[PDB]
Symmetry: D3
Subunit: 290 residues, 6 copies
């Protein structure tokens, strides 16, 4: 009976051996999809990342870290729901608790809008850093203020100006651009990165900010390195630009998330890049602290 | 921390609420693939069946049973291995234990050859009932006696004549047919079923056998109702023939298994039929005992 | 400029050569999708049906009817929305308007929930005829009484006992089976049909009803024939069982809708089946009024 | 040097072991497609059939015939060409030739219009038996008489009345149905079959004809069994219906072909049925000659 | 009755709001394919482009141009035809016509051979700028002069020397390379670009030509960015390289087209780049006329 | 009968018009696959490369070389086997025989493990050059020392220090990093290449080595360019980095293999890249010996 628990186990991130009590890093999943209009399937993103992860080594070669000894847990997934507001509420209290207990939340989702709940838990020293191809700055979309095209908006409301940066941007609504409050966020385009490099904007954030929260909207990355994103936008960042950003900023991170790609639209390469960025986050941080 | 175990959970069959201790039905998964030459992916079958299952109702309408109150557990999956012999050994001891403890093993696999381990645990009153498009009767295949094209062979060696029946058969090797021992198994073709019906051969088994073990090689079923099978064979059984067989024989079953289909070769309809047959098995049996 | 309109045209059903005024059958799409919790994509089915239509002939062989002279019209799609109530309200209006004008509404939708709007606009002497794998009889699903899992409950409230029949049903939640009002609807299982034939249940309707509305939730059909449906359920009707029903009730029908299949889950076959069901409705009816 | 030819071989039908001269059954591909409108990819069918064959046993259980010892050869594929007339003319020579030598041509194709070729080669006693969802009976299509929707018409031009049957049909253009010549061919609807059984229509042909040529347009079968046909038509024949047709008629068959499916549109199940249907033709024919000769 | 036309509409480019008469930019599809050998499905490109466009914003951030107020119209698609000459002749009339009215034709196609049409309509001052992985510069292919591998050749026949440039090329048949006439066209290799930057070659064209027509053969782009092109060729141009080409040249452009990709071969990313490239042409051109007129 | 052989032919590389005797480059396939534990399908890559080849021209533009007159040969495939050792033994023989005859072996395989056989047949003055994402330096994997995760360990045993260089490496298990013998191989990261360029590492080989063998494990290339590889790893080489290496070492090379990509995981692009790498090897070399 226990000899059976010893032989069989449910699906998990391979290196998340530690339970919650002992974990420095707490990986969890939020299967929410219900405001996405173009491609659907983000619901299934966490699970497919658990799938991809087996192909990965328990040791990170670039950083010289063994993830097996990094203290990761995987709680799994929350109930599927159709209600953005309930989903946001739950994220909020979950992120509170992890952070409160001296741990670092790593949230795997479907949609971007779950990040709103995370922002709600941010203290005043923490600044927000987004990777994204769109400014999610609409006042509302589809009669919902929590449509995943409003996340940058919701974040402004909660944090104020001189607090939020988003990088990769190359899709913006007119309604958004003409808004006065638009200038209250630092929007950095993919074209800017392609011209001046990534380190320049990584510098600005590393100077200005005591602590950070990193949210990765997968579609900021060019479709070539990430085909399965929910809303593809040509001319985007390189997977290495996002690696570099994470690499540099992870020592100051209170929390992390990866959102907005759909396992049903490719054969696994995107969920692979996702699982790998989850590695870069934990490995770069452990090297730093040693 | 416990409020978290209350919100998050790892992937499972939805109705497998009960732990091992309280379960009448013990679902587990065996991710083995390593002798399959044509299509690969059975490794991933159990997981995809967990996936499909959510679309299903917790109540069975045809049998009037609520699976939530049927006492199912899901232990999960065993370690992936390349070694048929190790995999077979482990299956053997697992099946022993469940049966020994008054419970009914329900094994989700990749390859058929894992059934060999199950047979090894069968008492003398139990007879074997297979659904399959091939006689897996080769003496050996690819320098392995445990190649999944030898399962009917291995089963003969263990059980003797007048013990094994396989239904759906429409692919047979010459080497197999010319073997003297071939007649020691009751091979029933799909063509026979299409002519005389299924109930006829279900009758023969229900008369002759005190108890049974049911093993479903998914490819016995016609490709139309099951596209993702590992080795497709046209002109095969109807999904309802297999339903009917299970429906009728489940009250005498000591154990069950579903094998030989690959989630990567279709969009989920096959793993759906699989998950549904898992239902028909438990529901038809609970109705009988009431 | 007018010689251009004669050289280019927008995507249409190739036999819908008549404008509204001069039409007997009015074809329109509803790209609504937003309560489907398994497979998503319904939204795109109208477009795809138009696409499949090109492979069909103008002359339906089995009825000596030429569809190019059947008075068909194609109005395209209604703007996408996330609001169920609002979508239903609009449907109610379009449907009422069209029947008032002595025309017949062929509604190509996404979800089944749009059928509610059609039900609202129905005269005391029209009964509802549904093909479906599920009873769709929930009082409410996922915080909503217009969830597509409720379309039959909603039909009941509008129409009362002895007006609604649903064929193909094999998936029922227990809450629905136990609700007292369940029996006020003639629920016919696919098992009943495979056993007693389809004509038996057709006779039961042709007798008891002066006029009808036909709703095809495409999953009533076995996944062998409609693999692209939103919620597959094995052991279903044959495509020829549905053809037969349409063939037989087409002369009494006031309207007709087709729902619940995501064209993304296959390579065209399902939407071809949907396009052929369309061509059947219009040819069997006209053949009649010859 | 020659040890290498012993280790490596080009791709073919695994049982096609003999050279042409020693072969009874000569399997060959014609990758032609350039008249097909709706789904394209027929060109690759013969290759995909060779690939699926590996999954099949060399011995056919239901006939008790070992295909390895049934005198099969595989010539491979013909060059691709955009010209219909050029292919049809090429087929005709290849069909005539193989029949002269008392061999049995099995033509794996793309489109159905390659069949026209084979029909030019037929003696007066041979009748044509077609499995198809449409009456490819159209005077012309897209400024082409040899367009793959006109195959039946071009067949009637060659054979005349009472020589041609086509089974499974369920899609007909009024221009064909209104032709006086339409009744000069036997058309059996997939609905006929589903109502009267296939055997009835098999019985008629067997009694009437002394020899046949069998042409299988893969879309005559219901899309559930052949999902990857070039022009799908629901409410078709059962995969078993076509098997029974072949089982019962292969002993009189002078030639055979399989056409109009496209491997790009599924994961292999359609080319697997196509390969099985080819086993069935050879095997059931060998069963006849082992029993009655 | 008329309330219904207010609720329902046929599918088109979401921003193509104006009728022809009031339009500056006239977008139209030509679903023609019947010369394409390797991957097929170009026919469906224009439809798939309209479908991806829904994912794009009506306002283009990098140019500060609202497309809804840029005078776009969408005529829809032309009948399908199997005849190359017939389509090319049809295009030529449609291109001439739209240019006469001082409008700007945006031709969404399948194959590249539709471009020939548009080239017949060009005035003497207009030069042709082609993005392509091959030199579709072949005297004939498969007994066809208007075969889609001969587009460049037929272009030279019409314009003569110094009038034509083609960028990104990395696949050439020796029969072309050995032609004396090969040097009468400017061919810039994708390797040239990757070495010297795209701007260099953009500078040359801008200085030389007073006006241009831009033809984008989608396979000139590296398969990483356009996976679903009809004839993929690795080591291609960056998606950004083509954007820069358009950005910089759309103010002189009398016409534009996008061709030779097939939506059947991916999940939408290629038609999404195709739709973005069309936004880029219109937007960057409007930016010029808002700044300098 | 002989006029038939002139009209039909079996699947071949369209420029391999010469028989063995008259050939300088000998192209052969090894459909071996049976130690790959993630994606399976390598086995089919030779066939697919032949298929992609049809889209290529006979004349390679960038080298003024006509491949129809380069003395190429295509021998087809070796019978499938499940035995690694045996496959390797056969490879060893074919490779030795071919180099002895002063011919160059282009081996199109499935797995990387076949390269071992080629390594066995190498003279004291030929160094090994590998493109790969992983170090492949395990002493043994999954109960086997000829697992494809070991191909570099096995290379070392045969060749000793200062003879083996591997470029693109970004995935290393810790056991390999810690083994003392690790440093006896020149391991070049894809990060090193993106930073310092590729030419730097090419110079390092062109100098230190008289002659070489080139092995392309296709996953060394970033999933953007070879999405169909057996084990994807993000942050990799550009396809042009590999082209460059081949361009530069082709004149010293004694053999050349291409491995580790399953054609099932894409729609042709990877095998096109593999076919183009083939055409590069043969054109860059010949251009040279002009
Ligand atoms: Mn976002
Ligand atoms: Mn975004
Ligand atoms: Mn089996
Ligand atoms: Mn089997
Ligand atoms: Mn339903
Ligand atoms: Mn329903
Ligand atoms: Mn035909
Ligand atoms: Mn046909
Ligand atoms: Mn071109
Ligand atoms: Mn091109
Ligand atoms: Mn590797
Ligand atoms: Mn390797």
């Amino acid at each position: 009976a226990s000899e059976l628990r010893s032989i069989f186990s449910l699906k998990k991130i391979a290196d998340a051996v530690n339970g919650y009590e002992e974990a420095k890093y707490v990986v969890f999943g939020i299967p929410f999809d219900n405001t996405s209009s173009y491609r659907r399937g983000s619901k299934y993103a966490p699970d497919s990342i658990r799938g991809a992860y087996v192909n990965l080594e328990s040791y990170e070669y670039s950083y010289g870290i063994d993830l097996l000894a990094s203290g990761m847990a995987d709680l799994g997934d929350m109930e599927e729901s159709e209600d953005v507001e309930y989903v946001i509420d739950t994220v909020e209290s979950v992120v509170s608790a992890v952070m409160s207990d001296g741990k670092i939340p790593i949230m795997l989702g479907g949609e971007h809008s779950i990040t709103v709940g995370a922002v709600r838990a941010l203290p005043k020293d923490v600044d927000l850093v987004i990777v994204d191809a769109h400014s999610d700055f609409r006042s509302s979309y589809m009669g919902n203020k929590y449509n995943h095209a409003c996340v940058t908006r919701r974040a402004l409301d909660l944090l104020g100006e001189g607090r939020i940066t988003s990088i990769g941007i190359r899709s913006v609504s007119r309604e958004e651009f003409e808004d006065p409050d638009f200038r209250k966020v630092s929007f950095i385009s993919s074209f800017d990165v392609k011209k001046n490099g990534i380190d320049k904007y990584i510098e600005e954030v590393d100077r200005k900010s005591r602590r950070v929260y990193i949210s990765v909207d997968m579609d900021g990355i060019d479709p070539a390195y990430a085909p399965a994103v929910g809303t593809p936008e040509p001319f985007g960042l390189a997977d290495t630009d996002v690696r570099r950003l994470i690499e540099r900023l992870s020592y100051k991170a209170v929390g992390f998330d990866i959102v907005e790609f759909s396992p049903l639209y490719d054969n696994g390469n995107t969920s692979m890049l996702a699982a790998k960025l989850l590695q870069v986050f934990i490995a770069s941080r452990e090297k730093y602290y040693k």
